[PDB]
A paper describes a structure:
Here we report seven high-resolution cryo-EM structures of filamentous peptide nanotubes based on a cross-α supramolecular architecture that provide insight into the designability of helical peptide filaments. A structural interaction is identified based on an appropriately placed pair of arginine residues (RxxxR) within the corresponding peptide sequences. This local interaction motif, designated as an arginine clasp, is robust within the context of these cross-α assemblies and can guide the coalescence of helical protofilaments into structurally defined cross-α nanotubes. In contrast to most structurally characterized filaments based on synthetic α-helical coiled-coils, the chain axes of the helical protomers are oriented in a plane nearly perpendicular to the long axis of the assembly.
Therefore, the designed series of Form I-like peptides encompassed minimal peptide sequences in which the structurally determinative distance between the RxxxR motif and the C-terminus was systematically varied over the range from 2 to 5 heptad repeats. Three filaments, derived from peptides 15-10-3, 29-24-3, and 36-31-3, were selected for further analysis using cryo-EM imaging with direct electron detection. Five protofilaments interacted to form the 15-10-3 filament, four interacted in the 29-24-3 filament, and three interacted in the 36-31-3 filament. The Form I/29-17-3 structure fits the observed trend, in that the 17 amino acid length of the structurally determinative segment lay between the 10 amino acid and 24 amino acid segment length of 15-10-3 and 29-24-3, respectively. Similarly, the 4-start helices of 29-17-3 and 29-24-3 and the 3-start helices of 36-31-3, passing through every fourth subunit and every third subunit, respectively, were associated with the axial stacking direction of the protofilaments within the corresponding assemblies. For the 29-24-3 peptide, the interaction occurred between the C-terminus of peptide (ia) and the RxxxR motif of peptide (ib + 1), in contrast to the C5-symmetric structure of 15-10-3 that involved helices ia and ib. First, the tilt angle of the core peptide with respect to the plane normal to the filament axis became progressively more negative with increasing peptide length. Despite the differences in cross-sectional geometry for the respective filaments, the helix crossing angles were remarkably similar and lay within the range from 95° to 105°. The length and flexibility of the arginine side-chains enabled the conservation of the RxxxR lateral interaction between protofilaments despite differences in peptide length.
Numbering used by the authors:
A (entry chain g), B (entry chain k), C (entry chain o), D (entry chain s), E (entry chain D), F (entry chain c), ...: 1 to 29
Write the structure that this text describes.
């Protein structure tokens, strides 16, 4: 496992912080 | 499990946070 | 279970959050 | 149960939120 | 592993810290 | 490794400290 | 190595202290 | 080396102590 | 060297002691 | 050297004491 | 008489906050 | 008499908020 | 009688804070 | 009776802090 | 009776501090 | 009765300090 | 019973100091 | 019983001093 | 039993002084 | 068993003095 | 001329803020 | 002439804000 | 004349802050 | 003249902070 | 005159600090 | 005058420090 | 007068340090 | 009267040093 | 009276030195 | 009277040195 | 493309926001 | 490009923000 | 560029920030 | 540049910070 | 430069810092 | 300079530190 | 200078230190 | 100077030390 | 001086040492 | 001085030593 399926959320949460910052590099570009 | 089926929500919640950010890179593109 | 049958709502609530965002990527596409 | 019959409302409420967004993806199709 | 898949969360965490800083150089450039 | 894959985080953390300082030189330039 | 890849952090940490001081000379310049 | 690559940190640390002092001479100049 | 490359630190440490004292003659000047 | 480059540190070590005391005679001047 | 009957308004105001909260539990039940 | 009659209006104003909430609880009855 | 009946308002205010929190638990349940 | 019934408000205030914390655990569960 | 019932608030206050901390462990789990 | 039930708060306070530290060990894990 | 249950707090206080240090060793690992 | 359990705190206090020092060897490693 | 378990604290106190020095030998290494 | 274990502390106390002196001659090396 | 008549606007703007508040005191009176 | 006529508009706009509030005081008269 | 009549605006602004607060004391009275 | 009428603004601003706090003493009363 | 009326602004300033604290004693009473 | 009325400000500030501390004793009571 | 009323400030400041410490004894009690 | 009331400040200052230490004995008790 | 009440300060100062040291025997106990 | 109470200050001054050293023989025990 | 035809919709969407604002400036012409 | 034609949307979007601001100046003029 | 045409968006964005600020000055003028 | 045209954005950014500050002076004027 | 045009930003930044500070003096005036 | 124009920023920076301090002297005035 | 214009910054820096000290005397006055 | 203008900084530096100490005689007054 | 104007700094430095001690004589008074 | 003005510093230096000694005998008085 129940944590094993729960652990991918912490993986996939970090995939947002790539992308929501990836707009910011275009924002003041 | 009742948590095992509940834990997929925490998976699927962050799946949205990809996509709403995935528009934001195309927003100020 | 009464919660077991209730728990699928928290699944299915987030199931919309893909799709209402999955148009927003198509919105400013 | 009286809540067991009441619990399906929370299921079927979110069943709409799929579909009313599922036309919004066809809006900017 | 359960930590092995959990360890990449610490890997990808700082990958955002590159990019949000990598806009800040473009900010006052 | 589990530490070997963990060790690159300490590497990649310091890559940010270049860049967030690399804006500060351009900040009061 | 595991230390060999770990040792570059101590190298790269000091690369910040060049640069964050390299703004301070331009600060009261 | 493992010390050979480690020893440059002690070299590069003192390079900061030039520059953070190099602001101080310009500070009360 | 491993000492030969290490020995320049003892040179470069005292190079700071010129400069941090070089502000002090300008301090109470 | 190895002492030859090390001996210059002892030369430059005293060069601070020329200067760090040079302020002191300017201090109560 | 002025504030004494005024005080029951603050009493009766909180009675409204029970009942909608006593209804809000019935909504997502 | 000006405020004494006016104070009951603040009393009866809260009496509405009971009853509509008392019927709002019948909506999700 | 001024504060004595005013005191139950502070009592009854926190009674609402139970129930909406007693509702929020069933929301993400 | 002024403070005696006032004290239960401080008792009942923390009961709300249980339940939303008893809710927040089920959120990221 | 004044402090005797006041003390349970100090008991029950820290009981909230368990549960949000009992939630934060599941967040980065 | 006054201090005897007061002391458990000091016991239960440190019980929270376990768990957030038990949480922080998973963060950099 | 006053100090006897008080002393366990001093025991349990140090148990927090283990774990954050047992976490800090994971941070720069 | 009072000091006999008090002494384990002094035992466990020094156990924290190992681990942060066991982390400090990792930092400049 | 009092001093006998107290004596290990004086043992374990000196165990910290190894390791922080065992780090300090790595710092100027 | 009183000083028999305390004597090792006097042994291990000087063991730290070796290592910092093993560090100090590495400092001005 | 141009600003002098604009100055009375900033006067007369705040002249309403009495009156719209001067009903609010009569509102919950 | 262009702004001078427009300046009275900013006057006469705020002349309404007296009066529409000046009936609101008659609302709870 | 420009600032002299402008100063009454700063006077009359705070005249409102009496009255909107003067209702708030009557609000929870 | 100009500062003298501005001085009462600093006076009359403080008259608000009496009164807006004067409700707060009735708020948790 | 100008400071003499400004002096009461410092006087009445702390008069609020009585009352907002004089509610905080009533807050957790 | 101007200091004499300023003197009560230093008096009346300390009256607050009684009361805001006078709540803290009742806070963790 | 001017010091005589100033002297009670030094009196009344110390009345706080009784009370803010008087909570701290009840804090870890 | 100037020093005679000033002398109690030196009296009352040390009254705090009892109590802030009086917590410290109960702190590690 | 000036020294006679001042003498108790030298009494009461050392009254603290009992108690702050009285924790120290409980500290490393 | 003036010295007679100062004499007890010298008495109680040494009473700390009994106790503050009493921990020291317990410290390295 | 299908996006190439979709992209001009984002172009022409902004073309509306020019003109209504370009006529909004004619409202306060 | 497809982004090249998308880029002018970000150009033309800011053109709207001029004109309403070029109108908002005309409003309070 | 594609960034070159994107670069004027950052130029033209700040051009709007002039004008609304160039309007806000005329508001409180 | 592309940075040359980007550089004027940093120039024109601070021009907005003049004018609202050039407005805020007229607000409390 | 490109720095020459960047340098005026550092000039014009502090020009904003005058005016808001030139406003704050008029606030508490 | 390029430093010559940078030098006035250090001049104009301290000009702001006058005025807020020139403001703070009116606050407690 | 270039130092000549830099030297006035050291002059004008101390001018700020007068005025806040010229305020702190007015604070506890 | 260039030193002649630098010398007045050392003059004016000590002028600050009067005034903050001039406040300290008022604080414990 | 150039020393003549520098010499008054040594005069004015000791002027501060009067006053802070002239405060310290008030503290334990 | 040039010594004539410098000699008063040696006069005024010992003048501080009177006053702190005038304070120190007041401390243990």
């Amino acid at each position: 496992q129940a944590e094993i399926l729960r652990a991918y959320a912490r993986i996939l949460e970090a995939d947002a912080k790539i992308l929501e910052a990836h707009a910011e590099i275009l924002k003041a570009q």
